[PDB]
Amino acid sequence: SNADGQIIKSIAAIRELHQMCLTSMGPCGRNKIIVNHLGKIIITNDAATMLRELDIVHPAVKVLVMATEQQKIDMGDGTNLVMILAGELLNVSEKLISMGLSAVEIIQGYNMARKFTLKELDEMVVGEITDKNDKNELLKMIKPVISSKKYGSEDILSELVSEAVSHVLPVAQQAGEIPYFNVDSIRVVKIMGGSLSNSTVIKGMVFNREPEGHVKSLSEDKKHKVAVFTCPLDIANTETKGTVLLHNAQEMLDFSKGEEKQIDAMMKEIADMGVECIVAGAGVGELALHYLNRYGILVLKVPSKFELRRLCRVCGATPLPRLGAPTPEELGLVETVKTMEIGGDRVTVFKQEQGEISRTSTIILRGATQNNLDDIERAIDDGVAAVKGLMKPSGGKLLPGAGATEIELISRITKYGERTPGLLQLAIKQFAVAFEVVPRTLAETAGLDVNEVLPNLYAAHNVTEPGAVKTDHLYKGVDIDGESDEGVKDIREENIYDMLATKKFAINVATEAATTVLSIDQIIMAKK
Amino acid sequence: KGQIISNINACVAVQEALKPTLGPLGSDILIVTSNQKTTISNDGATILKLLDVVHPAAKTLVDISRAQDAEVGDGTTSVTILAGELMKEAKPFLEEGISSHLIMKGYRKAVSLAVEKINELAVDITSEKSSGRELLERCARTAMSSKLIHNNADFFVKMCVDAVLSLDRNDLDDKLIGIKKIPGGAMEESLFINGVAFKKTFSYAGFEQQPKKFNNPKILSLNVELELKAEKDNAEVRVEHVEDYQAIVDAEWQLIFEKLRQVEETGANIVLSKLPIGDLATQFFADRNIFCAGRVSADDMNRVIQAVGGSIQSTTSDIKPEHLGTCALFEEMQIGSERYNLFQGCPQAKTCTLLLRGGAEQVIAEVERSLHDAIMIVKRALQNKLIVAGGGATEMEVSKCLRDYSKTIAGKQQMIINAFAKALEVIPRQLCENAGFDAIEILNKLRLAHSKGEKWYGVVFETENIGDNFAKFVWEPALVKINALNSATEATNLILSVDETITNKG
Amino acid sequence: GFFYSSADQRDKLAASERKFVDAKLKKIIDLKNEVCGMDPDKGFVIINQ
């Protein structure tokens, strides 16, 4: 019942899990170790992945989990930010509940402050991204997304992602109707051993499987014919019935000798057309590997059927459900097929040079630690996901991050509090206080004192200027310090900012996340 | 902060097991695997691999040891002790209010300054005041000192240096040199073998033949079983005729005679396989001077392919004539009431074998592992020309320089770097305690001459005293000291960065 | 049944059964060009449950 503080118990249960997400965002934050049910330690910065592995029967927590999926799917950033904003709205609302304020004015107060905040976001944009897609220009948007994970490696990993995005985007001008970037077209590989400086950017899909045959790689001639066969290699049979059975020993000689002549006849018809590569998605027999060595055909196997759909858009080959029909219309062309040593093992690399432009790219990564390669691999997928948000719907607009905008918006929210009469004055003032948790967590995770960073941010953004036009610098953020002497510095010097499409979309998600929790005054479940 | 403190004791518990195993004179730990097999070793790698600790931070110290054993292979024990020592130094800092984030930040600046000092202490020297043969011989006597073999170490160094020189200096591996234990006999009578040798577990008949003197025997690999015996399957054949009872026992001898005839036409004088060879063939091979040995391990058969360049064929039909190989000379010794088979004079052999003799099997096991520590010093001498002074020399100076550089640094990083410099004192400590010397007296006496400006002063492992390891011939490569500070810091940064431990059962 | 010695002979027998569908498709495409075939702002949509 409400006399026992049921609305407080729902907040207290989330407040105990609120401190977990407070240490997620930021490079100086902390990570949580979660043991998977398969007996493997999995750790990552992104909260949307950890919430899926954690089993929580609390429906109030699931409200923030479902709101987190909106930041993970529709956007490439803001998964850790929505958990901090929605979690703080429940704590600041305890002051209004203790005073006897109904949940109507609390929800109505956030709705009125939501339209006031979203309207001011258009004036917070100073510069606009021209979408040049240049290698140096893409480093501005990609760096803050790759940041707050594996601090210190953001300088080298910035050139790997920025180069892969330019390869996926085709060359076009004055056309915004047709989409270009694809999320699933970029696959990242990891191999133990090596160093970070040995990484590079290659156009294609790197195959780590063994060549399985005496032919390691093809020649240097352009447009290698590649055939993708879905049906496994076996003796030619009849589509109707055609079941092989054992009855008399006389048929045993025809079974062994029959498979040698039929398989050799099918490989001869394919080699006559000039096909130098055969891709078999299923298992390959032993007798098939002996004939491909004399014909000079590269052996390649792809056990994963998910990569066969994306392979058709790269080389141009088509899968054939039958076997023995080398249709020329289903054959692809690739310029370069070689074999290089990646991570200490010999692997066959699949790439190209100029012709047959493909949208599939692969970022090769190396490292000694296996757990560190998991976060870097997932950071690239979250880094390239922000490219989708660079399109016409406010993709060029930007706002200063790292605590610069959250402190500056406080002065604008408090100004509208006394301007709007009625009971909404209490909800507007508490709406700006809930934004003070973002700069506070950045100072705690960085080792800085709470009494230091907070008063310095207010004095930096609040000055007396005899004039209407604002002066000095409004870009002052939360500095990590740990260097130089004292004070903060301009965040624009490091080219770190929060994209407006990430911040504006996160406000609507954060308000609706805390609205559902505050609107539910009673819960009923069963023992499980 | 409660789970962080729990992770501190988890690292000390794992570190405590590796403390007595640090150093050549250190104690050995006994671990009983679930397989009920007794395993005793002082190498931290194998020790941590057999524990299989469910604790996430304790497993991190195990995973980082595998990376130290892969890229390098030396220092797997010291990298965990150094990594876990930072957990104890950072324990009182958490209660005082100092966050572990600034503590992890001070380590990145301390190691960056420590690696620069390692290259300054590494001096490349090859032909200066040293010869070609005496260079690797003086390095083997370092690991053999203060051991039961010190009296016989004069004869053991000659066999150790010849094992490395018998292989290409560009590619060297400790797994390429085979060692077989010979029970019984004198220790000083051991000899070195250029080829490959196995245990010869075949106990069956057919002795007194196949003498130890061969001219040019032909080696051929074997896959299937040459004997006609069928161990598993069978059949039921019965006739009702009286006179046919004789002829129904007489048949099967002809079956494999067809395939066995092709073996005689090849002329292979050596028969080896991963399966036990039947006793049927042990006679006629003596007439043709063909040698055969059964019950050979699978690991010893891989060295035969790399020796004479042989190949494994399934049947006796398609065997090619060029797959055969021959050695210069054969030798077989009956010492120890057991015959031992070994090959000699193989110019194409990529491996060798060193036989060891002693009074007991447990005595030789301590001699074999004491040699492995000397092999790594001889192997890394020719591979890497940059070496640093070990045995307390380098370890004490890295902690000294950080004390002076911390004076110019202001803020919490001063006491953090000083804590990292103090954490470096655990390495020389355990080396003295495991060797019997008092770690308290040496710690005070070593810091005396350490402040006189000379950075090469080490700790004598034979007689307790302070001095320079340059006369003790204690050499260590620079790649181990550099990668130890990076692997210990990276493993420590992952444990201190996790406040909450979550484990889901499935 | 499909009796073929080589894979090239199977396409000849498999196409014999495919002519039944292609024969009906020729009458469908003729309806589009019959009424307002070349006229602008015209289309032909097949439901085909």
Side-chain angles (χ1 to χ4, degrees):
Chain A
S1 178
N2 57 33
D4 290 344
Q6 186 174 356
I7 190 65
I8 304 301
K9 294 177 179 177
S10 296
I11 295 170
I14 296 171
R15 182 177 181 171
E16 294 178 351
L17 296 175
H18 184 198
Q19 294 178 336
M20 176 178 71
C21 296
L22 295 175
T23 59
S24 296
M25 178 178 71
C28 296
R30 291 192 296 273
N31 291 283
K32 272 68 180 180
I33 294 171
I34 295 170
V35 176
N36 192 30
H37 60 284
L38 296 175
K40 183 178 179 180
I41 295 171
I42 295 170
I43 183 169
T44 188
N45 192 341
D46 181 67
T49 300
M50 293 184 286
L51 294 175
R52 294 182 182 175
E53 294 178 351
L54 295 175
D55 186 5
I56 295 171
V57 296
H58 300 289
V61 177
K62 294 177 179 177
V63 176
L64 276 66
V65 175
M66 294 183 286
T68 301
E69 296 301 321
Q70 294 177 336
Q71 296 295 101
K72 179 62 174 172
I73 296 170
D74 290 344
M75 295 301 294
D77 187 4
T79 59
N80 291 337
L81 178 63
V82 63
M83 295 299 294
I84 295 170
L85 296 175
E88 184 67 15
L89 295 175
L90 296 175
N91 290 336
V92 297
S93 296
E94 294 178 350
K95 294 177 179 178
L96 296 175
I97 295 170
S98 178
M99 293 177 182
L101 178 63
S102 296
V104 175
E105 296 301 321
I106 296 170
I107 295 171
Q108 185 64 59
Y110 296 141
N111 290 337
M112 295 300 294
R114 182 182 64 195
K115 294 177 179 177
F116 295 160
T117 300
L118 296 175
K119 183 178 179 180
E120 295 301 321
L121 295 175
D122 290 344
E123 294 177 351
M124 295 299 294
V125 176
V126 176
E128 183 178 2
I129 302 301
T130 59
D131 290 344
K132 184 179 179 180
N133 291 336
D134 187 5
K135 183 178 179 180
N136 290 336
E137 295 301 321
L138 294 175
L139 295 175
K140 294 177 179 177
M141 182 65 73
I142 295 170
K143 183 178 179 180
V145 177
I146 304 300
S147 65
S148 296
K149 185 186 293 179
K150 301 299 183 181
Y151 176 78
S153 63
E154 63 184 343
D155 290 344
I156 295 171
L157 296 175
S158 63
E159 294 178 350
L160 296 175
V161 177
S162 63
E163 183 67 15
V165 175
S166 63
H167 298 166
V168 176
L169 295 174
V171 176
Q173 63 180 19
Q174 294 178 336
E177 294 178 351
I178 295 170
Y180 297 140
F181 177 80
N182 189 340
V183 176
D184 290 344
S185 295
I186 295 171
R187 181 178 180 272
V188 177
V189 297
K190 60 180 180 296
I191 294 171
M192 183 177 284
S195 178
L196 178 62
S197 64
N198 291 336
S199 296
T200 187
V201 176
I202 304 300
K203 295 176 180 178
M205 183 176 284
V206 175
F207 295 159
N208 291 336
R209 292 178 63 85
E210 294 178 351
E212 294 178 350
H214 297 166
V215 176
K216 294 177 179 177
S217 63
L218 296 175
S219 63
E220 294 178 350
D221 187 5
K222 294 177 179 177
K223 294 177 179 177
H224 296 289
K225 294 177 179 177
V226 176
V228 175
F229 295 159
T230 300
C231 183
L233 296 175
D234 189 4
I235 185 169
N237 291 283
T238 300
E239 183 178 2
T240 299
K241 294 177 179 177
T243 299
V244 176
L245 296 175
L246 177 63
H247 294 82
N248 290 283
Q250 294 178 336
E251 294 178 351
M252 177 178 71
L253 296 175
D254 291 344
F255 295 160
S256 296
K257 294 177 179 177
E259 294 177 351
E260 294 178 350
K261 294 177 179 177
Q262 294 300 321
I263 294 171
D264 181 67
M266 296 297 103
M267 297 297 180
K268 183 178 179 180
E269 294 177 351
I270 296 170
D272 290 344
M273 293 178 182
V275 176
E276 294 178 351
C277 183
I278 294 171
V279 176
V284 176
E286 183 178 2
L287 296 175
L289 296 175
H290 182 62
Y291 296 140
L292 295 175
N293 291 336
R294 294 182 182 175
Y295 296 141
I297 295 171
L298 188 147
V299 176
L300 178 62
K301 182 178 179 180
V302 178
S304 178
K305 294 177 179 177
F306 295 159
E307 294 177 351
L308 296 175
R309 294 182 182 175
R310 293 173 296 180
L311 178 63
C312 296
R313 294 182 182 175
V314 178
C315 183
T318 300
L320 178 63
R322 296 288 294 173
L323 188 147
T327 299
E329 294 178 350
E330 294 178 351
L331 296 175
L333 296 175
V334 60
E335 293 178 350
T336 299
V337 175
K338 293 177 179 177
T339 299
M340 294 177 182
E341 183 178 2
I342 303 301
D345 290 344
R346 297 293 181 189
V347 296
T348 299
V349 295
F350 178 81
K351 62 189 183 70
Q352 63 181 20
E353 295 301 321
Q354 295 300 321
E356 296 301 321
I357 295 170
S358 178
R359 294 182 182 175
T360 299
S361 63
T362 299
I363 295 171
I364 295 170
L365 296 175
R366 294 182 182 175
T369 299
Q370 185 64 59
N371 290 337
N372 290 337
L373 296 175
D374 291 344
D375 291 344
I376 297 170
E377 182 178 2
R378 294 181 182 175
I380 295 171
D381 291 344
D382 290 344
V384 298
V387 177
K388 183 178 179 180
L390 296 175
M391 294 177 182
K392 183 178 179 180
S394 296
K397 294 177 179 177
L398 59 82
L399 59 83
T405 300
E406 294 83 357
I407 302 301
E408 183 177 1
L409 294 175
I410 295 171
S411 296
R412 294 182 181 276
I413 295 170
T414 59
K415 183 178 179 180
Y416 296 140
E418 296 301 321
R419 182 177 181 171
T420 299
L423 296 175
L424 296 175
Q425 295 178 336
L426 296 175
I428 294 171
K429 293 177 179 178
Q430 294 300 321
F431 179 80
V433 177
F435 294 160
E436 294 178 351
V437 64
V438 176
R440 182 171 294 105
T441 58
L442 296 175
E444 294 178 351
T445 58
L448 296 174
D449 187 5
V450 176
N451 291 336
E452 293 177 350
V453 176
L454 295 176
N456 290 337
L457 295 175
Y458 177 78
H461 299 290
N462 189 340
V463 295
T464 299
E465 296 302 321
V469 176
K470 294 177 179 178
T471 59
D472 188 4
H473 300 290
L474 296 175
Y475 297 140
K476 302 298 184 181
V478 176
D479 187 5
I480 298 171
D481 290 344
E483 62 185 343
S484 296
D485 187 5
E486 292 177 350
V488 297
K489 62 182 178 181
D490 290 344
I491 192 65
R492 59 177 182 183
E493 294 177 351
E494 294 177 350
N495 291 336
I496 295 171
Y497 61 89
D498 186 5
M499 177 176 70
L500 178 63
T502 299
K503 179 62 174 172
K504 182 178 179 180
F505 178 79
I507 302 301
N508 291 337
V509 177
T511 58
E512 295 301 321
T515 299
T516 300
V517 176
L518 295 174
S519 63
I520 296 169
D521 290 344
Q522 186 174 355
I523 59 172
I524 294 170
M525 293 178 70
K527 183 178 179 180
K528 183 178 179 180
Chain B
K1 294 177 179 177
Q3 184 63 59
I4 295 171
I5 296 170
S6 296
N7 291 337
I8 295 170
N9 291 336
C11 296
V12 176
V14 176
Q15 185 176 356
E16 183 67 14
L18 295 175
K19 292 177 179 177
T21 60
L22 178 63
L25 296 175
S27 296
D28 291 344
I29 185 169
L30 175 61
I31 295 170
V32 176
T33 59
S34 63
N35 291 336
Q36 294 178 336
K37 183 178 179 180
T38 299
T39 59
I40 295 171
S41 178
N42 61 345
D43 181 66
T46 301
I47 294 169
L48 295 175
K49 293 176 179 177
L50 296 175
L51 295 175
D52 290 344
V53 177
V54 66
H55 190 279
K59 184 178 179 180
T60 300
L61 296 175
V62 176
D63 291 344
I64 192 65
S65 63
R66 294 182 182 175
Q68 185 64 59
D69 182 67
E71 294 177 351
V72 176
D74 186 5
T76 59
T77 300
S78 63
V79 63
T80 300
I81 295 171
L82 177 62
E85 183 67 14
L86 296 175
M87 296 300 294
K88 183 178 179 180
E89 296 301 321
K91 183 178 179 180
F93 295 159
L94 178 63
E95 294 177 351
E96 296 301 321
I98 295 171
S99 178
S100 64
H101 299 290
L102 296 175
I103 296 170
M104 294 182 286
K105 179 62 174 172
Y107 296 141
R108 294 182 182 175
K109 294 177 179 178
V111 175
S112 296
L113 296 175
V115 175
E116 183 178 2
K117 301 302 287 185
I118 295 171
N119 290 336
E120 296 301 321
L121 295 175
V123 176
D124 186 4
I125 182 169
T126 58
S127 63
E128 296 301 321
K129 294 177 179 178
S130 178
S131 64
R133 181 177 181 171
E134 296 301 321
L135 177 63
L136 297 176
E137 293 178 350
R138 294 182 181 175
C139 296
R141 294 183 181 276
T142 299
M144 294 177 182
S145 179
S146 296
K147 301 298 183 181
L148 297 175
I149 61 172
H150 187 278
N151 291 337
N152 291 283
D154 291 344
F155 296 159
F156 295 160
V157 174
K158 294 177 179 177
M159 294 183 286
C160 182
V161 176
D162 290 344
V164 176
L165 296 175
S166 63
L167 297 176
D168 186 5
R169 293 173 296 180
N170 290 337
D171 186 5
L172 294 174
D173 186 5
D174 290 344
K175 294 177 179 177
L176 295 175
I177 295 171
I179 295 170
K180 302 299 182 181
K181 292 181 295 297
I182 294 171
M187 294 178 71
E188 62 184 343
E189 294 178 351
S190 296
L191 296 175
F192 178 80
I193 303 302
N194 291 336
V196 63
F198 56 90
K199 184 178 179 180
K200 182 61 174 172
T201 59
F202 177 81
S203 296
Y204 295 93
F207 293 160
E208 294 178 351
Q209 294 300 321
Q210 295 176 336
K212 63 182 178 181
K213 183 178 179 180
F214 291 160
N215 290 336
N216 290 283
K218 294 177 179 177
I219 295 171
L220 177 62
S221 296
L222 177 62
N223 190 340
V224 297
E225 294 177 351
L226 294 175
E227 70 280 5
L228 194 146
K229 182 63 173 173
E231 183 67 15
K232 294 176 179 178
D233 59 353
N234 58 33
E236 294 178 351
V237 175
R238 181 179 180 273
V239 297
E240 294 177 351
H241 301 291
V242 176
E243 294 179 351
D244 289 345
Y245 295 141
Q246 181 66 60
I248 61 172
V249 189
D250 294 343
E252 289 182 352
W253 183 88
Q254 187 63 59
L255 295 175
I256 305 301
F257 177 80
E258 182 179 2
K259 294 177 179 177
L260 179 62
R261 182 177 181 171
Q262 294 178 336
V263 177
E264 184 277 336
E265 294 178 351
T266 299
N269 291 283
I270 302 300
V271 176
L272 295 175
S273 178
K274 294 176 179 177
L275 296 175
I277 295 171
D279 291 344
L280 178 63
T282 189
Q283 183 173 354
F284 177 80
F285 293 163
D287 290 344
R288 298 296 299 277
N289 290 336
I290 295 171
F291 179 80
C292 56
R295 292 177 63 85
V296 177
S297 178
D299 290 344
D300 291 344
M301 293 299 294
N302 290 337
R303 297 182 183 276
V304 177
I305 296 171
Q306 294 177 336
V308 296
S311 178
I312 295 171
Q313 185 64 59
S314 296
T315 59
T316 59
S317 63
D318 290 344
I319 294 172
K320 294 176 179 177
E322 71 280 5
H323 297 166
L324 296 175
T326 187
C327 56
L329 178 63
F330 178 80
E331 183 178 2
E332 183 178 2
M333 296 301 294
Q334 294 178 336
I335 295 171
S337 296
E338 183 178 2
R339 293 178 179 83
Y340 296 138
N341 294 335
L342 60 84
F343 296 159
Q344 186 174 355
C346 296
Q348 295 300 321
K350 302 299 183 181
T351 187
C352 296
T353 299
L354 177 62
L355 296 175
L356 295 175
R357 295 175 62 184
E361 294 178 351
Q362 295 300 321
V363 176
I364 297 170
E366 296 301 321
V367 177
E368 182 179 2
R369 294 181 181 174
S370 64
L371 177 63
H372 297 165
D373 290 344
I375 294 171
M376 294 183 286
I377 303 301
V378 175
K379 179 179 76 179
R380 295 183 181 276
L382 296 175
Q383 294 300 321
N384 291 283
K385 302 299 183 181
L386 296 175
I387 60 172
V388 296
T394 300
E395 293 83 357
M396 293 300 294
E397 182 65 16
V398 176
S399 178
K400 181 180 179 181
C401 296
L402 295 175
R403 296 176 64 185
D404 290 344
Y405 296 141
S406 64
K407 294 176 179 177
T408 59
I409 295 171
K412 294 177 179 177
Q413 294 178 336
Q414 184 173 355
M415 294 183 286
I416 295 169
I417 294 171
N418 290 336
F420 178 80
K422 183 178 179 180
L424 296 174
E425 296 301 321
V426 64
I427 295 171
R429 181 177 181 171
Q430 295 300 321
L431 293 175
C432 296
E433 294 178 351
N434 290 336
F437 296 159
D438 186 5
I440 296 170
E441 296 301 321
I442 301 301
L443 178 63
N444 291 337
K445 293 177 179 177
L446 178 62
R447 293 182 181 175
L448 296 175
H450 185 62
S451 63
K452 293 177 179 177
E454 295 301 321
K455 297 176 180 178
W456 290 273
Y457 294 142
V459 176
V460 176
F461 295 160
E462 294 178 351
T463 300
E464 183 178 2
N465 192 30
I466 60 172
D468 185 4
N469 289 338
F470 178 80
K472 302 303 287 185
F473 296 159
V474 176
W475 293 355
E476 293 178 351
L479 295 175
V480 175
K481 301 302 287 185
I482 295 170
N483 290 336
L485 296 175
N486 290 336
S487 296
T489 300
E490 183 178 2
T492 300
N493 290 337
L494 295 175
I495 296 170
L496 295 174
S497 63
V498 176
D499 58 353
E500 182 178 2
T501 299
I502 295 170
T503 299
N504 290 336
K505 294 177 179 177
Chain C
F2 295 159
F3 295 159
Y4 62 92
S5 64
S6 178
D8 290 344
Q9 294 178 336
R10 181 178 64 84
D11 290 344
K12 294 177 179 177
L13 296 175
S16 296
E17 294 177 350
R18 294 182 181 175
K19 293 176 179 177
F20 296 159
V21 176
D22 290 344
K24 294 177 179 177
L25 295 175
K26 294 177 179 177
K27 294 177 179 177
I28 295 170
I29 61 172
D30 290 344
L31 178 63
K32 182 174 179 290
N33 291 336
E34 183 178 2
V35 176
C36 296
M38 295 300 294
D39 290 344
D41 290 344
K42 301 292 183 291
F44 178 79
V45 176
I46 295 171
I47 301 301
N48 191 30
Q49 185 175 356

